Every structure is written in structure tokens, then in C-alpha cells.
Amino acid sequence: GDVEKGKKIFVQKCAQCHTVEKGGKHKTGPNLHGLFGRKTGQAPGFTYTDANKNKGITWKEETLMEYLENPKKYIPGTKMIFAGIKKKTEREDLIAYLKKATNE
Numbered sequence: 001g002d003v004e005k006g007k008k009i010f011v012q013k014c015a016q017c018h019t020v021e022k023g024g025k026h027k028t029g030p031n032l033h034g035l036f037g038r039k040t041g042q043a044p045g046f047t048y049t050d051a052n053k054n055k056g057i058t059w060k061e062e063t064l065m066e067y068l069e070n071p072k073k074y075i076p077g078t079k080m081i082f083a084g085i086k087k088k089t090e091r092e093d094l095i096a097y098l099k100k101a102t103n104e
């Protein structure tokens with residue numbers, strides 16, 4: 001749960017299409033503020049695939065751990081183009097960082 005290595009993974013691997021700050025803007029991928037604790041496909045103003053919208057699960061560490069590994073497998077037909085973070089640590093790191101930054 002190194003929030004400090006998580007941030008690197010985020011910038012190196014998510015920042016292209018995503019913003020985590022409040023008031024932050026939708027890029028290719030939506031803004032992730034208020035992520036934790038909300039259903040999938042909830043960011044306002046963004047245009048979700050119907051999959052991402054109907055997944056209907058709640059984001060929190062458990063569902064993230066699972067999604068980051070093969071997003072396409074977690075939400076088949078998701079417009080997000082991203083293979084997944086294979087190693088568990090990275091995924092905990094990156095989850096540590098999002099729990100933090102999408103809530104601050």
C-alpha cells in the first residue's frame with residue numbers, strides 16, 4: 001500500500017485517460033473522484049459503454065483488485081483499452097493511491 005509507488009503507476013499507466021482530482025475533467029476515460037463507494041458508470045457527464053454502466057458493482061478495494069487485473073474480463077465490452085496490472089503488489093500500490101487521491 002505504497003501510495004507513493006501507486007502514484008507512479010497511475011501517471012505512467014492511467015493518467016493519459018484519467019483525472020482523479022475534484023473538478024478534474026473527463027479525458028478519454030472519466031474522472032475518478034468519488035470513485036470508492038459508488039456504483040460503476042456513475043461519473044456525470046461522461047459517456048459510458050452500456051457494459052460499464054450495467055456492471056452494477058460497487059468500487060472498493062476488492063472489486064478494484066479484481067478489475068485492474070483484466071478490465072476486459074471484469075466488464076466485457078468496456079471501451080477502456082488497457083490490458084491490466086498482472087502483479088498483485090502494483091495493484092495494491094495503485095489502489096492505495098486512488099483510495100487516497102480520489103477521496104482527497
Ligand code: HEC
Binds near residue numbers: 009029052081
Ligand atoms: C485510456 C486508454 C485509458 C487508460 C490507460 C485507462 N483507462 Fe480507465 N477508463 C477508460 C475508459 C474509456 C473508461 C470507460 C470505459 C467503458 O467501457 O465505459 C474507463 C473506465 C475506468 C474505470 C470505470 C469506473 C467507473 O466509473 O465505472 C475505472 C475504475 C478506471 N477506468 C480506472 C483506470 C485505472 C486505475 C487505470 C490505470 C491503470 C486506467 N483506468 C487506465 C480509459 C482508460
